[PDB]
Amino acid sequence: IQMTQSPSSLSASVGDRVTITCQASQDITTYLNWYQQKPGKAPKLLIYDASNLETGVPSRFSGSGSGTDFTLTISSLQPEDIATYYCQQYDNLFLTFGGGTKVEIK
């Protein structure tokens, strides 16, 4: 399985509506995770099953998609959200991560 996320990087102002996509090159149906890794720290889980928001992250985040196309959105990009985001499938136990995507404020 291969994953590709676009864009590789992006920059937006505080309060904007950043959107990052991921595609699976194979039918994944709904099995997708979204992680967030701030610089120098361990990642955190944000969304599981491609749309189920985790119990300890604010509702600013949202995720949607099915099959081969998926998308993660930030309703109002706050300064705390500067990090790298990853998509990871688990349809096959030899699970693979994506290449990542970096956000920036201006």
Partner: protein, 50 residues
């Protein structure tokens, strides 16, 4: 009832005595949930990690 804020107060209650609540925050979100009532006078307070 202004301080409690939430409208989900169970029926059968009597207005005129103190009811205890809990406010739970999840980031920028706040919810009020009813837990029950407590005696008028307390002598010891105990809370566990669980």
């Amino acid at each position: 009832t202004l301080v409690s804020g939430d409208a989900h107060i169970p029926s059968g209650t009597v207005l005129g005595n103190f009811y205890c609540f809990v406010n739970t925050t999840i980031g920028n979100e706040t919810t009020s949930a009813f837990v029950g009532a407590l005696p008028k006078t307390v002598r010891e307070f105990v809370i566990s990690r669980t």
